Design a protein around this ligand. Structure first.
Ligand SMILES: [Zn+2]
Ligand SMILES: [Zn+2]
Lengths: 4, 109, 109, 4
């Protein structure tokens, strides 16, 4: 996943 | 004694699981909803976006195969709810493994 | 279920804490005996030689600093007693750390 | 430490  | 904020969640209205799973009504996403909820995450309703109720970290673009707990630690090692839940060796584990992968790929310059 | 080996200690007579501390009567050594005992080690009456009552692994030449549990997992990661006492992350962590060091050292060829 |  990727952070935001 | 262990701080102000750290001690206190970024979104108390989401401290209880029940509160969090609900947010996952329509989960058309690969990742499991019960699991995210357990890991402290909840859905913002902006796609597969989620946010930990305590450290307030947000993740998105989840892959089918991903584990809520792992990416929580992979990205937000500092969350206290994480430390109480999965312990020290767990967190450091995830990070060491990454650190190792990096060094092993550094042989490739 | 666990195998022949594994489940079963190599020295049943030493499975108890008490049983082991009593071997460290005359402990003229740096490394703390109550600690050695807890990690499952018992003295062989041959210098600072100790052995795990389970996996049977033996350790010598202890340094003042050293932690029984670390050395235990560092050399005998496969001990069942150790897994029950310290869990997986611990063992795998003790080991990831080393692998990492070997890798950071390899940048020196 | 060391093995034996
Ligand atoms: Zn968090
Ligand atoms: Zn052992």
């Amino acid at each position: 996943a990727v952070p935001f | 004694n262990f701080p102000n904020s750290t001690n206190l969640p970024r979104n108390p209205s989401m401290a209880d699981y029940e509160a969090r799973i609900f947010t996952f009504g329509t989960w058309i996403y690969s990742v499991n909803k019960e699991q995210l909820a357990r890991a402290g995450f909840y859905a913002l309703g902006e796609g597969d976006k989620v946010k930990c109720f305590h450290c307030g970290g947000g993740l998105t673009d989840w892959k089918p195969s991903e584990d809520p707990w792992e990416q929580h630690a992979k990205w937000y090692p500092g969350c206290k709810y994480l430390l109480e839940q999965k312990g020290q060796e767990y967190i450091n584990n995830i990070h060491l493994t990454h650190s190792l992968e990096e060094c092993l790929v550094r042989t490739t310059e």
